[PDB]
């Protein structure tokens, strides 16, 4: 039952562990070729510099990822980029360096259709996790069918990413590829959950005792006990806050403490397998694993409490015993179990820790139920009829009047315009409600990646955003509130746009902004890039469904003042039409605001304009 869930057998685990140990003898990495499998093992390090970067001035050695090199490691709709440990990222950067032949070896294995496996022990396993993401970004994501599913297997690895990191891994359906083995008491997976000020004095000694090749520094009881107590105190604070950061009826005190609490951002990413003498327990839910990292590291009675720090040290070197006795241990998948009492009882988890784990699992199943309900909703006839009516009845009738459905909605002279407004409001309510669920993290990580949702939301945005723009300008909202692009655009459309752009752009490693600015510079405007960015600030040319918004912002202004934005809109129009973002049957109509304004442009522009032959 273990292999059908993790997709790896005991053979691969054993080879990965052997390579991770062999990596101790190299400078950067060791490559082990085992027929169809190529294993890259990274050398671990036990200096405090390699856990908290000296030049990092944050309380947990964290740093935001560069959106250019890891475009997927972010929230799509919200935009917030993921955060990782800076020391681990610098170490990965040092191993990806062309001079190391690491990348050449990766591509040699890729061309050979070998099963690629990334692995490492202790902090080396953390590097392996980041290397896997690099692989996922560079190779697997561009065409995930012919490329072979990789595996990342870590042993006692520190935590690497934050909650956004885990969310992004979940959305891409990548978490299933990661297995992190953690012996019950192992202190190392808990290390980065503590504030760096809490262990600044005791960390070098503990790292010296944990290093298997450093039998020089004499073991000190005091330092290890102080270290364990500091780590457990900060871990307990993080876990209890995570408990509160799920429930409710206390958002005020949580916001005040958020302004005054420094809690570690690092969260479990991927499947975790906890091991005892008699059990192997696999867990997928990151929140549940976070809780288990605390409640599995306590004493059963409190008189053994003086003994626990030494077992928490010794357990970091007990993964060898784990690997040899895998098949002799009882395995269960915690998320799929009908009863979790036995597993958590064997892990020494207290009653309260079990109730927190159960609550985290209940919350994830609630999110799954919400997604099933959303699919049932968006497939019902009463919902789809509104979009069908807008597309097949309102638009053709407005085209027949030779003014278009934007101008017809804007003047709203007929009953059909108020009926369209009613259905626009109902659709707005439904998509705002979905956005609300997303904002509260009450949908599955995969939600923003579901292609059925992206299809529907794109059809909705293309059909109805022109109508919300018309409604906006009908009520004179642009000077009072401000620019639509600046202060008026509903967030639901921004989420829809970003979800679609990510869906279509992520196989090519590029981000929407880069594609946009490359086309803008491709339009041969001649102006300085900084000047154009100044002109195109809050421009409507970043999304085809904001075409009419840009017209509103461009009409009335002198030609010299917004010439660049005009030429930008023209350069985007044909591709937008080809892509279906803008309907060609609408914008050229006799009574269209766009056509009426386009004729009033100077004749020198209209003469050499791409639209001369269309109006």
């Amino acid at each position, epitope marked *: 039952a273990f292999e059908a869930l993790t997709g790896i057998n005991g053979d691969l685990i054993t080879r990965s*562990w*052997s390579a991770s*140990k062999q990596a*101790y*003898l190299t400078e950067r990495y060791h490559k082990e070729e085992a027929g169809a499998v190529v294993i890259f093992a990274f050398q671990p390090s036990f200096s405090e510099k390699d856990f908290f970067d000296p030049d990092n001035k944050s309380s947990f050695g964290e740093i935001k990822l560069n959106r250019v090199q890891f475009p997927c490691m972010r929230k799509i709709g919200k935009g917030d980029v993921a955060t990782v440990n800076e020391a681990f990222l610098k170490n990965l950067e040092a191993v990806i360096d062309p001079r190391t032949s690491f990348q050449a070896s990766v591509e040699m294995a890729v061309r050979s259709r070998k099963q690629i496996v990334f692995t490492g*022990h202790s902090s080396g396993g953390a590097t392996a996790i980041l290397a896997t993401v690099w692989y996922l970004e560079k190779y697997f994501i561009r065409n995930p069918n012919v490329y072979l599913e990789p595996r990342c297997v870590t042993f006692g690895a520190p935590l690497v990413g934050d909650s956004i990191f885990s969310h992004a891994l979940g959305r891409e359906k990548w978490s299933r590829f990661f297995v992190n083995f953690v012996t019950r008491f192992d202190i190392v997976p808990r290390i980065t959950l503590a504030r760096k000020a809490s262990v600044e004095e005791t960390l070098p000694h503990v790292l010296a005792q944990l290093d*298997p*090749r450093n*039998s020089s520094v004499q073991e000190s009881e005091q330092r290890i006990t102080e270290f364990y107590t500091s780590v457990m105190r900060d871990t307990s604070t993080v876990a209890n806050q995570a408990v509160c950061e799920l429930t409710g009826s206390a958002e005020a005190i949580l916001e005040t403490l958020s302004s005054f609490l420094e809690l570690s951002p690092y969260r479990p990413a991927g499947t975790f397998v906890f091991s005892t003498e008699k059990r192997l327990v696999a867990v997928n839910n990151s929140d549940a694993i976070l809780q288990m990292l605390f409640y599995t590291c306590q004493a059963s009675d409190e008189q053994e409490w003086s003994l626990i720090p030494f077992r928490s040290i*010794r357990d970091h*070197h*007990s993964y*060898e*015993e784990l690997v040899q006795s895998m098949g002799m241990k009882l395995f269960n998948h915690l998320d799929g179990e009908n009863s979790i009492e036995s597993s958590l009882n064997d892990l020494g988890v207290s009653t309260r820790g079990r109730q927190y784990v159960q609550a985290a699992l209940e919350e994830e199943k609630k999110r799954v139920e919400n997604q099933k309900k959303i699919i049932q909703v968006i497939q019902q006839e009463r919902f789809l009829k509104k979009l069908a009516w807008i597309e097949d009845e309102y638009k053709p009738k407005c085209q027949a009047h030779k003014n278009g459905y934007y101008d017809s909605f804007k003047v709203s002279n007929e009953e059909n315009d108020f009926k369209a407004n009613v259905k626009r409001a109902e659709l707005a309510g439904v998509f705002d409600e979905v956005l609300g669920l997303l904002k509260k993290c009450q949908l599955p990580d995969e939600f923003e990646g579901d292609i059925d949702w992206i299809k529907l939301a794109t059809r909705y945005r293309r059909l109805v955003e022109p109508l919300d723009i018309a409604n906006y300008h009908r009520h004179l909202k642009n000077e009072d509130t401000g620019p639509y692009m600046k202060r008026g655009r509903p967030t639901r459309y921004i989420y829809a746009q970003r979800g679609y752009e990510h869906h279509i752009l992520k196989p090519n490693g590029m981000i929407a902004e880069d594609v946009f600015w490359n086309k803008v510079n491709g339009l041969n405007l001649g102006l300085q890039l900084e000047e154009i960015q100044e002109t195109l600030k809050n421009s409507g040319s970043e999304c085809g469904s904001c075409f009419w918004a840009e017209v509103e912002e461009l009409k009335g202004k002198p030609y010299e003042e917004v010439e660049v934005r005009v030429k930008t809109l023209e350069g985007m129009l044909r591709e937008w039409i080809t892509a279906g973002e803008v309907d060609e049957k609408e914008i050229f109509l006799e009574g269209s605001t766009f056509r009426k304004w386009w004729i009033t442009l100077p004749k020198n522009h209209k003469s050499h304009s791409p639209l001369r032959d269309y109006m």
Partner: nanobody
Amino acid sequence: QVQLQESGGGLVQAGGSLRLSCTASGFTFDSYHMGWFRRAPGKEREFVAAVSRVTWLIDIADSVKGRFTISRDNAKNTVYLEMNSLKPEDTAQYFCAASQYDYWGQGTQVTVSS
């Protein structure tokens, strides 16, 4: 830089006892098990007996089982193998491998007279 150290070999008659030591100085002391193998010119380098430097549990191959014994000491990072009631077939060069072998040292001779 990193190497192994062996000591203990010699020559005993039948039904004797011999203790072999294995200094594990260098790199990675406890994350490995350690296991004695023996190679006799004319016989393959079969397995003798291994044990973990975290788990006292001793695995002993059947060819030498019941007569050999292992012991562990992480302080001096050393695995000891004591054997008794030896028989003429125990003549070989013994290597204390890293169970997932780390490297291959020099080993020690062990000879038993009839």
